[PDB]
RNA sequence: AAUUGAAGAGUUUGAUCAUGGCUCAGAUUGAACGCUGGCGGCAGGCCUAACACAUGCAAGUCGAACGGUAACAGGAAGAAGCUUGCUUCUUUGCUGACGAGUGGCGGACGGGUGAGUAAUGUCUGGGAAACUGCCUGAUGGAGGGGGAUAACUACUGGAAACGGUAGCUAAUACCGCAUAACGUCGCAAGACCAAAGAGGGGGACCUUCGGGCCUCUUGCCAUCGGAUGUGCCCAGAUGGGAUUAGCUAGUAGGUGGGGUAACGGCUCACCUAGGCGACGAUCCCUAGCUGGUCUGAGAGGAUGACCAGCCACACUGGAACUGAGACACGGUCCAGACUCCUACGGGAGGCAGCAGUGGGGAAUAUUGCACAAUGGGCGCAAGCCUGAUGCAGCCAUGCCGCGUGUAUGAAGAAGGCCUUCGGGUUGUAAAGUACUUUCAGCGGGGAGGAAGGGAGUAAAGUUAAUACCUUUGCUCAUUGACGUUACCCGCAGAAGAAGCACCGGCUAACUCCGUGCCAGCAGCCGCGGUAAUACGGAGGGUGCAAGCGUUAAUCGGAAUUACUGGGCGUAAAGCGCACGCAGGCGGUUUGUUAAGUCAGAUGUGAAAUCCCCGGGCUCAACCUGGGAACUGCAUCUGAUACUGGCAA
């Protein structure tokens, strides 16, 4: 407040916003791919699987999405599409 | 030879599961008389079918659920 | 106010001479304590149809303090006697509307107001 | 992260310094990993002034410690007083 | 600090000199020597348990010139030391550097021998040292130091130092103003003089 | 070198012996009060309202990541008045720079506090299913492009805070694509994910003569490792109360989905019906804990400020972001209490940071100085910042050192006090004489804390480069906040410097006068009603000392809750008596196991600290080397008498 991280709240801003997208993209991107699961189309589902997976390491190179956890969704994710598949 | 212990059994029915009684005998510090003391553990163990006085040998292990954090490993006899 | 600053040597000697002056005070304190008992033989009032009004007093101004409380001790009759218990200086305090409380008196201050500390006896007993 | 410094234990206008590896992130009288060795400002003409087991800090450099500037003067000092 | 009164007081109270005159006069003559300490201490000589306990630590405190704390830290310091508990108090307190004056005989009582600690005169292995309750160890030299050395408050001194006691713990020399002292001081040396045995046992009633 | 450690007294009765309480002598304190106080060293100094706060300061930093001139300091060109060769004045990022701004990292550390918190915490010993900035070792890449936008300009709303509209512009900011295993996910085949440049100098080729390009330094990226740090889990131990006895629905377990960095009822859905409980659940009251400190012969007890480790908190209440790391003491949002400013429309704040103030209370401090040193933040370094820290101020608070003179001195002066009025005492004390001058007072001198860093040189290493830079030597300039430093030398002259409690018994130390069961003394049993060794006063005496005493506080003494180490016929104390479950304990013989137990070994048991042996501060306190202690615990290997288990 008093001191000048009036630059460093400004700062958290701009940078959560942006995250905010990428994560939003991330997740709707990620819920499309489940909706195919649900579905059961085996192809549609491996279709937006190939779809994921530059998206899912490309933000866990980000870093905002993390690498451990980005590694255990195409884990888990690939568990239900070679059920299905 | 890595880390175990002994001690019997007092569980009913929760499957893959066995609650362990292990006692143990400990001085008081005061007084100098040893009491029996009773560290009642839960216990993981698929195919769980021991006897409610059976005796049996026991190991730590990972959180297996919460609360069991020990594994069984033999079992001494088959007590009724 | 209305006396004397001069300024000294060293700060050491100056408690000293505060010392010393705190022992005049206590010089003042005993003339004080002495003169009420040999004016009139009673430690209060003579007759026995008494009647008091006691107050306490804090002005904001130390002039003033000292100046109008002179004042309301002036108007008094025999019959009924009125006096100052505890004057203060400046704003009210937990001490002050104790004092009050103790001892049955009327709790004025001049531009002085109350504090939360004498606020939490006031709510307790509204003096 | 591990840093090799000089810890003030001494004396009013006398100080004894303690050179010691800690962690950076904790007070310079705070947590420690072992003591290392000692120094008084005062050697004289005693048997002992400097001293320092260079074993030790060779090898926690070596795992990547950092030397405060007058310990890394200290030690290209104290040699084996050569 | 130091006592600051009649010296006679003390030496009629303790019931013997304590070495605070010159030894001309005044040991039998000026003193009134165990006759009466006060106005009406002539009529008593019975006493207490605590009181011959007590009198001699004051007998004791007041030949060595100490006060009843620095007493009680060399009855703590000697309580540490392995051997004689009774003996090493004694140590202690004959161990004072103002004691090695008197001694030397420099100084011809002991307050007088203070006053040459106090006045800067007095050097030990090539120190100067003011400090009154300096101990002197063994193998090391004392001497009074070479500036201003033998004044007319030392000199007079020398003559009654030629002939009093002279003992063998210090080494002595009183020519060019100087000790060496090699061994310690030992129980045979000045035992029976005070009840040492009493004495360490007082600070536990 | 390391086991030398333990006391009792007074008091119930006419008197005694018991029992048994009460009381005192001890040590100790973050102390207060009272009276008195010379100097020095060291240590320590709001334990009350987690009550509220004026004013100042407490972390910012890189132009060597970037547009830039807002600085302002030079230089140049040019335009000009001349001083006539220079000054002057407009341009100009040319150049040493550098505000606001953009980007990166630091802001999550240190510092302060003890409210909540009885274990989710803490301590010890173990563990598995985990991550981990910066910082290092290793192996390789560092290709090719693109779009914005603040600042800044032009408008415009505002009292102020603080903004609005529209264009323009860069980057180690942001975003695509190429490129990709030893990596992630997969059984494999495979799929897919990164990039950033900046800086110094230089022959050659050449350049839209900006540099291309070379070479050195550094940064960027991915991956396998290191050490560190943190999260997680389990066992045991770690306040009080039974006039708290029943307690638990995400409760307890399973499966599956989802979630976290990761195990996990972590959270859902669904299934099952359990879990905890006399070894004290639950509830309530109460509290930060330990290494330690204090006391204690030891065993024990009390205590946890100082110091350090850990945890928890940051006006009240809750949540998330950013980021490696926070659910963030001087970040953000929202809600609440409350406080302030104002042009009244609308805005602002969280000193349990350092100083400092109100209030509180018996009571705890200077609105100081400096980055000189140590340790940090940023940076390549310089450098800058550092209320951490180093220092100083204040306080007899504690510990400890020292002084306030020494020697002689009988006529044993006068006075005071007593006095059988013979004398005695105060008292060698004074007086007098002879001496010394510490520490003060005053005038002179002067270590160490300073090693480094900077600049200049040389070598060596490096390179296409005698370059150029670093490393490693040399040399020269320097670098002290405290500071009138510690410490030393010279001078005058006993000059400047002793008080306080107590004296019936306990308990060391006695008379006289006054008052007269009054006034008062009292910690305890008790003193005083005219001859008071106990009141008041004096004289005398004793203890202790710059402190002394009282009070409050804790342990001791107290074997007076009794493990070590107690009683219970009649003194307090055996249930009215019996049967009985849980519990404690168990004849005698043999075998076996080796839990308890006993032995050995390794690891660990932070350091400070206590102890034992040393060193250094003018000497001690204090500081400091080394050892022991590290009283415990765990794992592992052994022993088999005893107890337990098991077998007959």
Request: hydrophobic share 40%; net charge positive.
């Amino acid at each position: 407040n008093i001191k000048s991280a009036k630059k460093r709240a400004i700062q958290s801003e701009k940078a959560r916003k942006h995250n905010a997208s990428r994560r939003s993209m991330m997740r709707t991107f990620i819920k499309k791919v489940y909706a195919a699961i649900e579905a059961g189309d085996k192809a549609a589902a491996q279709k937006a699987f190939n779809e994921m997976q530059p998206i899912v390491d490309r933000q866990a190179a980000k870093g905002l999405i993390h690498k451990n956890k980005a590694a255990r969704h195409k884990a888990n994710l690939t568990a239900q599409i070679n059920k299905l598949a | 030879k890595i880390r175990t212990l002994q001690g019997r059994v007092v569980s009913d029915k929760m499957e893959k599961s066995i609650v362990v009684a292990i006692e143990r005998f400990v001085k008081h510090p005061i007084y100098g008389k040893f009491i029996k003391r009773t560290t009642k553990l839960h216990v993981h163990d698929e195919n769980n079918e021991c006897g409610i006085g059976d005796v049996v040998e026991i190991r730590e292990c990972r959180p297996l659920s919460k609360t069991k954090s020990w594994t069984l490993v033999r079992v001494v006899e088959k007590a009724v | 106010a209305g006396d004397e600053v001069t300024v000294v040597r060293d700060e050491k000697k100056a408690r000293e001479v505060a010392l010393y002056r705190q022992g005049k005070f206590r010089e003042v304190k005993l003339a004080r304590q002495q003169k009420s008992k040999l004016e009139n033989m009673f430690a209060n009032m003579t007759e026995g149809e008494v009647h008091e009004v006691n107050i306490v007093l804090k002005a904001d101004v130390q002039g003033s303090v000292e100046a109008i409380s002179d004042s309301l001790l002036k108007l008094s009759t025999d019959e009924v006697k009125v006096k100052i218990i505890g004057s203060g200086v400046g704003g009210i305090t937990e001490t002050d509307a104790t004092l009050a409380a103790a001892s049955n008196a009327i709790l004025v201050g001049f531009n002085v107001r109350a504090d939360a500390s004498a606020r939490k006896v006031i709510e307790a007993e509204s003096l | 992260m591990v840093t090799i410094r000089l810890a003030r234990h001494g004396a009013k206008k006398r100080p004894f310094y303690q050179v010691v590896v800690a962690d950076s992130r904790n007070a310079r009288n705070g947590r420690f990993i072992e003591r290392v060795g000692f120094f008084n400002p005062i050697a004289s003409e005693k048997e002992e002034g400097t001293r320092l087991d260079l074993d030790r800090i060779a090898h926690w450099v070596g795992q990547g410690a950092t030397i405060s500037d007058r310990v890394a003067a200290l030690i290209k000092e104290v040699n084996k007083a050569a | 600090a130091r006592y600051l009164g009649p010296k006679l007081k003390l030496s009629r109270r303790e019931g013997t000199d304590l070495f605070l005159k010159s030894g001309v006069r005044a040991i039998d003559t000026k003193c009134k020597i165990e006759q009466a300490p006060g106005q009406h201490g002539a009529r008593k000589p019975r006493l207490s348990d605590y009181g011959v306990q007590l009198r001699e630590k004051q007998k004791v405190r007041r030949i060595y010139g100490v006060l009843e704390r620095q007493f009680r830290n060399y009855y703590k310091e000697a309580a540490r030391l392995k051997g004689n508990t009774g003996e090493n108090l004694l140590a202690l307190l004959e161990g004072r550097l103002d004691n090695v004056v008197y001694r030397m005989g420099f100084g011809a009582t002991r307050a007088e021998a203070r006053q040459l600690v106090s006045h800067k005169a007095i050097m030990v292995n090539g120190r100067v040292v003011n400090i009154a309750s300096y101990q002197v160890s063994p193998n090391d030299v004392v001497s009074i130091r070479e500036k201003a050395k033998k004044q007319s408050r030392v000199k007079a001194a020398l003559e009654l130092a030629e002939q009093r006691e002279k003992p063998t713990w210090l080494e002595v020399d009183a020519g060019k103003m100087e000790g060496t002292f090699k061994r310690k001081p030992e129980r045979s040396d000045l035992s029976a003089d005070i009840n040492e045995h009493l004495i360490v046992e007082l600070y536990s009633k």
